[PDB]
């Protein structure tokens, strides 16, 4: 009697978690929003913004119209090898953006201490990849992390809050080009006789300069020790695969809960009903970039109910012009809705005057939302790059480009309101007293924007 | 000298013979029609219906507009794993339809009484799937088996037919969930020291109970014993294969007989000239589910040539309005063809009153070619899940739903009249005296019919 | 710690590497126009003309529509039989057309004695995959070789030329169905103790009977002496692969430089942009075949700059209607333009006056480019197979069928003018003294072309 090679693993559900973190697959928590969910963990921070900065030359006619394709041929090549380290070290890619990806190793508060040590050595093997031939830049934190979900009987969106997550921005922020740095609470709670460290000046924060463990120490036996905590490591008949979520069978209800995470073009193609090469593409979109901050960012049961109903509202004034959200996340301070008018096949007439109307909208119904302290718009168009990024095993679709990293610069340096740059002033031919230009402002990693503006509205009042 | 991996054996025509049984791929008969061939072996029926009875929910809006994906992919998920089953096992799935398959295991006859203990065992396994978590019923019957091949010059359809054939299906409709029943002549050929049976009541039919075989018995010598009699199990280089066609290499001639089995649209698929998962949908459609009845329906000499003028005039018929013939097959009484106007994307206007008076024109014709003595049709419109059912090396395009059960379902309990749902009668919009208002019947499975009407055609008289 | 299986060679950059040989794919030279080189080796003429015509009975109506589908599955299956074999044996491939493929073994040269062997062994195991169950014939050179790579910023082409190159067409041309024919220089250099030979008629090439090595000769471990000298032959790790291109990593620049090979459609297919199976058919194209002849076709220093100025203007003229070129290569005599009107989607409108139109303007510019002595130009249109023809690992867009054999005869035997086919003439509704009716010539693979007729221009004078 045969017994043949069990094949097939291919299966939408399958290809839909690609798209998720283990922290979703597997989370099986209530259909009710907001969401909430506390722990602790290890969070990776790696800056991937020298990858990232070269969409604009992949628009040269150097390129001869094939830009998009190579741009995410090499920026997956780089990206992935990343995201395998992190996988065979144990832990779960949260989310990918145009200058990071974010990771966790989520453990019982007693085994923090070892895990930071793994997570240090991954670190250091990530930074071994691109030593000689492009870098990154890692910060790690631990502590308390709080999880958000939120969405509605269609869609849902996730979000990570904390300190933890604070840090982890402030410690990927003070790190040059090939640096690990720690939040001052993962240098509180790591393994001091494993690594050596140096001062960051006016930073409680550290650097590591070396791990160099005990006489005695095995690396190898002591991840094998780790991975008693670590609940989905592949292991046993699965040891050879990179993430569990690759055995996922067929099962309706999860699969229902899990494609509301994912954008319906994406799914259009996982079901074979689109070319597996149409989403990437060099494309010109308007993003519209909202920010909103809150008393304290850390109060999950505070912030929940607000990010809840602003992302009601949000919804509603996207629909009507297929805006889409691509990506929430929170930013050094508050959260973020990365929004974007124009990408798979969505892309209407007037995108100019539409996006500043739905931002003004969006602004003043935020604005009213209890506990909102402040919300802050960056709207920005031009060519910009759209994809699926990462790994075959873990990979999300993903907006990169100039334009994009301007609309988040603007939200930041022009808080409290709704500003445009110029191509979307001139565009919308509006007419002119709609704006106020506005003062020039040097921009963290924006070199040469032109005029920016604010959009008044429609009334001096 | 390098020995590189043999890799490529993903050819057209091994796509297209994975659409197709053994007895067909490798049959090698002429092309001829009709042609009838006779053997004997044992069958295999098992009632999927408790699977496919899903679709109506998969239409819920719970399911966002991926319903039929999903359906697609939980019901090949189990399918599958009972087709595997089949395969390992030894035998050869002969069809599927959105209620059952049919599986045969051809030997000469000295070998039956072995054979049946194969497939019992089979069939316990398989029940042995879905025990603790949708179930299914088999039916068993041995003995003598005509083939029936008929078609023009660029398409062709099988069928068997005969009492082996009679009785698996009465095996099959007086199982309940997880029985295993064999027909009467199947219990007096079987080995009855190997199984435990009971008596069912008004029938000469039995029901296994238990597979307990004599202490010395091995049942893997049993089936390699066994194996001598099986002509493609796959072995040796191949035994790590579920099927020898998977090994087929291109050959015109071949494949230009295996072609003509296999509707256009998916040709088109396994050419790579459309998307892989454009077939799979939930889609309106008209089905016209035309059954022929024969004075003896197991007398392929005296049946065949009856078919064959009856389906040169129903291709015809349905080739002005590209309805199609998705399926041929014995019902428990006679020979029934499942049309469908609307699924490839095939879909005309007017769909309603043509595929009515595609079904009168089919009437009038078959009722008056010799030997047919009762043609009856039932037609019924409305969403049908139409796709690729199976596993990757044997699976069929297939239509499942309500409506094709209430066309079955009528043109059995209404014999001798063209008759038709409410959602035709109402759409056609045609004067209400074509039409007679019918008796409502209690059908099998068959809940809320709606008004059911006979299409008496243009004229009193 | 997992070590996961290493999967990923799929990138765009090692499908356009399919495309072309390691002659080009490792090359690393300037990107300037013409580039020439210069080296020694063996080159290998297989003629397959009997396998490519078939084309003409793939156009019956026995094949339902799916002619152009069995053709390139029939092709394939046997084309890559032998490229496996020159691969093995350490050959590159370096083109393919529509009745042949040459490769090349490059080696320093003192190793092309040994080397001779290796292709002799290798040539006959391709004659014996036939032997029994459409053969070839087999022309062998050995020398001296140049490479011509010339074109523009966006499209690169490249062509071998020099007397082993004319060698091997002269070779190929005397060999009868399953001959191994050496050219006199192959003959010289050969190793004579190896092999048994015949004269050929008022010929100093010679025709391989036997290789009967001495008592001691081990052919295995002759090859792995050979395989030093083998630059790319895959080895180490990477023994189980026919070609290490299949391990090419992303490289921007690199695949900037071997996407200029490779035709736009092509590549949209590679990009996952256009079904994979959407350029292979049978379709009605015109060829314009241009020959351009030299007073010294070995001299690339010569012919080099004028090619390349000849390619400058065709591609100038092709351009104005998608004409396209297909491919160039050294025929018998001169260098060949295989042009092509109506292909992957680029099917305009009075397709044949502007052929026509478009050949004239080729034939007036080339006849003025110093260096080129003749310039003969045969246009023919009808239906032609367009397909991806070779392995997986190595293969080509290639155009095959009578007008394109039609094409070719026509600007060899009518040398001096442009000429075209009746389909040309009539369609073109010209009017008739545009052109003047020629004699019929029976020309070689030619039967039944219809009335011949020189395209004369516009003007009298
Ligand atoms: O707020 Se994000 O770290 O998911
Ligand atoms: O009549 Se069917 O069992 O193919
Ligand atoms: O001139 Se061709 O042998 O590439």
Same mark, same amino acid.
């Given at each position: ?8 693993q291919?299966?939408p ?17 209530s259909?009710?929003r ?13 800056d ?12 040269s ?8 394709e ?8 780089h ?8 996988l065979? &070290?144990?832990?779960?890619?949260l ?14 508060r007693?085994q923090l ?6 997570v240090?050595?991954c ?6 990849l691109?030593?000689?031939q492009?870098?990154?830049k890692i910060?790690?934190?631990?502590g ?16 990570? !809050? ?42 409680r924060?550290?650097?590591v300069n &070396? ?11 002591? &991840? ?7 609940h989905?490591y592949?292991?046993?008949?699965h040891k050879?695969?990179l ?24 799914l259009?193609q996982?079901?074979?009903?689109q ?14 970039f909202?920010n ?14 607000? !990010? ?25 301070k ?11 096949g ?12 739905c931002?003004?909208? !969006?602004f003043?119904?935020?604005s009213?939302?209890?506990? !909102? ?7 920005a168009?031009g060519?910009? &790059?759209?994809?699926?990024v ?6 999300e ?11 988040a610069?603007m ?7 709704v ?9 919308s ?16 990693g ?16």
């Open positions: 009697m045969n017994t043949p090679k069990e094949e097939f291919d299966w559900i399958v290809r839909i978690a690609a798209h998720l973190p283990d922290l979703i697959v597997y989370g099986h928590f259909p009710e907001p969401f909430m969910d506390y722990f602790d963990g290890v969070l990776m921070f790696v991937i913004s020298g990858f990232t900065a070269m969409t604009e030359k992949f628009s006619a150097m390129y001869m119209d094939r830009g998009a190579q741009l995410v041929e090499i920026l997956n090549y990206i992935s090898a990343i995201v395998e380290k992190v065979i &070290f144990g832990g779960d890619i989310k990918f953006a145009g200058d990071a990806l974010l990771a966790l190793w989520r453990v019982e007693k201490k070892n895990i930071i040590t793994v240090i050595k670190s250091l093997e990530i930074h071994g691109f030593e000689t492009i870098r990154v910060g790690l934190a631990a308390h992390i709080s999880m958000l979900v939120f969405g509605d009987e269609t869609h849902s969106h996730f979000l990570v !809050i904390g300190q933890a997550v604070d840090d982890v921005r402030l410690a990927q922020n003070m790190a040059q080009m090939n640096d690990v740095i720690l939040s001052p609470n993962c240098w509180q709670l790591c393994d001091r006789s494993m690594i050596e460290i140096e001062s960051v000046p006016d930073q924060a550290v650097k &070396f791990l160099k463990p005990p006489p005695n120490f095995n690396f190898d036996e002591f &991840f094998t020790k780790c991975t008693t905590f670590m989905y592949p292991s046993g008949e050879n695969l993430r569990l979520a690759c055995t996922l069978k067929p099962d309706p209800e999860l699969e229902m809960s899990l494609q509301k995470y994912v954008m319906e073009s994406i259009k996982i079901d074979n009903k070319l597996q090469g149409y989403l990437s593409e060099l494309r010109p979109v308007t993003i519209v909202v909103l901050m809150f008393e304290d960012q850390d109060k999950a049961e505070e912030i929940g109910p607000a !990010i809840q109903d602003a992302y009601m509202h949000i919804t509603s004034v996207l629909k009507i012009f297929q805006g889409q959200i691509n990506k929430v996340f929170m930013f050094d508050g959260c973020s809705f990365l929004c974007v008018f124009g990408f798979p969505e892309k209407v007439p007037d995108e100019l005057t539409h996006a500043l109307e931002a003004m909208d !969006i003043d119904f935020c009213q939302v209890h506990k !909102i302290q402040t919300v802050s718009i960056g709207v168009s060519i910009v &790059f759209c994809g699926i990462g790994h075959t095993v873990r990979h679709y993903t907006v990169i480009g100039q334009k994009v990293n301007l609309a610069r939200m930041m340096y022009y808080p409290g309101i500003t445009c740059d110029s191509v979307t002033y001139n565009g031919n509006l007419p002119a007293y709609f704006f106020k230009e506005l003062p020039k402002k040097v921009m963290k924006v070199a040469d924007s032109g005029p920016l503006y604010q959009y008044w509205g429609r009334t001096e009042k």
